[PDB]
């Protein structure tokens, strides 16, 4: 592990690199080993955080916080790494998340269990990129492989049973199964109140996540609307307000002020009572033109002044002030309104319509929060996460965040594989039975692709307390004989191994891109052959 | 994707081919109005129907995913065009796939 170790025929001093003495390499063999090496201690730290019986991690930051979790990105995100094998792998797991939003620890796992067997084949002495290109033939059998044994759902408005069991499958691994009905109904209707169905596209922009320690979990619910941090602006305004005609204002209820260097010069007795009188019509004319287009109810931007809070309270306009430009625009989406950049141009066109405006409280805090629900079409809404500590409220957060992403993936693909570690199953098999009919080198290499695929049912056993191998062996005995590539791993001890009857249920377009992820990053693991580091 | 083939006593076969992993069933059907002579399931369990029973000798060979009528007791009303019905994968509505039929 040196740069350079001659220092010459002849006596005389050898330096070709830059601190050459101080910097490390490792070539050939033993660098594929060292990068197998790091690989499964990643894989091996994630196996265990995999499916219904997986178990979480907490993680602490360099400031000394505290995260409970048992997402795979999460995890490998918050962990200090130091490897280029681990953050290479870290990588691996944040594309998953970022293409699906589920899968990001079986991505691990299978990476991790393609390099161990790698690890023998190299040992074997077969060429890295001969078993790179074994698993390229490989993945693609086992992708065609779960084209074919594909399933499809109903992406409807009308049946949302089973995109509420796809949320459920996604939901299964993590704490908030307490509340699992509950939280796959509020992620399939909150992605389906706000979905492009015709362009097959979701905004999360649309969807507001909001969490509030307090309360219970099962008090977490979908608005369909906008809630606010904010409350009223006077203390003695009304704390609730229904049938709202609501105006967006970007404008602060305050004087006019060009942005332009300006000096307004004040040369008399009457130009500063013209100025007095100005700042007064000013005021009582924001007022009287938020009046006069029929608004029961302001939110402004940008905050404003003691003249027009108390002109809205007497008025009865009541208002809220220092709203940010996203909620703005999420209320203006919610309740059918126009941003207004200024009272001359308000108009009762442009006003929004909310059902119901209320102030809600949370117990002895002095903390209240602005709802704004019953619009009548909401293409926008919120979820407000409730429960009794903060590390619970952010895993309840990311979880619902991957029940969203899957059912995103449904509607971008209803296509579906059933889990359990059944299509895994079905996958080695088809590899296995390709690499039969191969006669080339690459047969040990798809026979190695197998037996990783392999791993994720193993690891679902294991952390079911099963046998890996007995349990699996059987799964697999029965897939072959009876066919049905819906037979995997009873995690929940329900009796029956059948996942389409469990409605253990994947989205095609995860697996698929698990496999390819995890192929990929193996691939380019497997290149590298040399490593230089100071 | 799946193409099917078909081919007082006779025999007619008909066996599928092309991209699956499963025929939940094989059923023989007459063409009238469309109906089913008879039809068997992969546990072995067939069911026949209720104008002709009895004397069906219908087999069906799962190592190739193929089927087999034996049919006796020939009468005129027997002559019509006869269509097997194949149920793969998960037998949804849309794996249900049929003959071209056989007209006797």
């Known amino acids: 592990s040196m740069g350079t170790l001659a220092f010459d025929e002849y006596g005389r001093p050898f330096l070709i690199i830059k601190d050459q003495d101080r910097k490390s390499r490792l070539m050939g063999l033993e660098a594929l080993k060292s990068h197998i090496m790091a690989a499964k201690a990643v894989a091996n730290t994630m196996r265990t955080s995999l499916g219904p019986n997986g178990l979480d991690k907490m993680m602490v930051d360099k400031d000394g916080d505290v995260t409970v979790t048992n997402d795979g990105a999460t995890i490998l995100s918050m962990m200090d790494v130091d490897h280029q094998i681990a953050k290479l792998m870290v990588e691996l797991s944040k594309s998953q998340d970022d293409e699906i939003g589920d899968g990001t620890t079986g991505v691990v796992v299978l990476a991790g269990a393609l390099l161990e067997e790698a690890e023998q084949l190299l040992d074997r002495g077969i060429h890295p990129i001969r078993i790179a290109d074994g698993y390229e033939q490989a993945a693609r059998v086992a992708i065609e492989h779960l084209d074919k044994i594909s399933d499809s759902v109903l992406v409807d408005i009308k049946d949302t049973e089973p995109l509420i069991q796809t949320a459920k499958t996604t939901l299964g691994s993590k704490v908030v199964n307490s509340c699992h009905r509950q939280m796959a109904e509020i992620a399939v209707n909150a992605v389906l109140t706000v979905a492009d169905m015709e362009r097959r596209d979701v905004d999360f922009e649309l969807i507001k996540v909001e969490g509030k320690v307090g309360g219970r979990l099962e008090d977490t619910k979908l608005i369909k609307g906008v809630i606010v941090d904010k409350d009223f602006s006077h203390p003695q305004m009304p704390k609730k307000v229904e049938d709202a005609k609501i105006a967006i204002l970007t404008c602060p209820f305050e004087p006019p002020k060009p942005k332009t260097k300006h000096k307004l010069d004040v040369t008399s007795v009457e130009d500063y009572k013209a100025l007095q009188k100005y700042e007064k019509e000013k005021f009582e004319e924001m007022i009287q033109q938020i009046k006069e287009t029929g608004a029961n109810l302001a939110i402004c931007q940008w905050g404003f002044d003691d003249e027009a809070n108390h002109l809205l309270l007497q008025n009865n306009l009541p208002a809220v002030r220092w709203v940010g430009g996203p909620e703005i625009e999420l209320i203006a989406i919610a309740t059918g309104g126009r941003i207004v950049p200024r009272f001359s141009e308000l108009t009762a066109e442009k006003l929004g319509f909310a059902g119901l405006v209320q102030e809600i409280s949370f117990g002895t805090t002095k903390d209240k929060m602005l709802v704004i629900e019953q619009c009548k079409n909401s293409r926008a809404v919120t979820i407000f996460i409730r429960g009794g500590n903060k590390m619970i409220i952010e895993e309840a957060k990311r979880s619902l965040h991957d029940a969203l992403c899957v059912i995103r993936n449904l509607i971008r693909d209803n296509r579906v594989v059933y889990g359990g570690g059944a299509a895994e199953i079905s996958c080695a098999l088809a590899v296995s039975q390709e690499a039969d009919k191969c006669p080339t080198l690459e047969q040990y290499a798809m026979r190695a692709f197998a037996d990783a695929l392999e791993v994720i049912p193993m690891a679902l056993s294991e952390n079911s307390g099963m046998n890996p191998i007995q349990t699996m062996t059987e799964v697999r005995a029965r897939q072959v004989k009876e066919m049905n590539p819906a037979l995997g791993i009873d995690c929940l001890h329900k009796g029956t191994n059948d996942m389409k009857q469990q409605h253990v249920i994947e989205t095609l377009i995860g697996k698929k891109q698990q496999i390819s992820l995890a192929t990929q990053m193996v691939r380019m693991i497997l290149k590298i052959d040399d490593i230089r580091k100071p | 994707q799946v193409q099917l083939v078909e081919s007082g006593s006779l025999r007619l076969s008909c066996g599928a081919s092309?991209?699956?992993?499963?025929?939940?069933?094989m059923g023989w059907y007459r063409q009238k109005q469309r109906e089913l002579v008879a039809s068997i399931t992969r546990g072995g369990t067939t069911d026949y129907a209720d104008s002709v029973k009895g004397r069906f000798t219908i087999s069906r060979d799962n190592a190739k995913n193929t089927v087999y009528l034996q049919m006796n007791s020939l009468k005129p009303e027997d002559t019509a065009v006869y269509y097997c019905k194949a149920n793969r994968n998960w037998g949804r509505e849309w794996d249900d796939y049929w003959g071209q039929g056989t007209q006797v």
């Open positions: 092309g991209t699956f992993f499963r025929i939940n069933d």
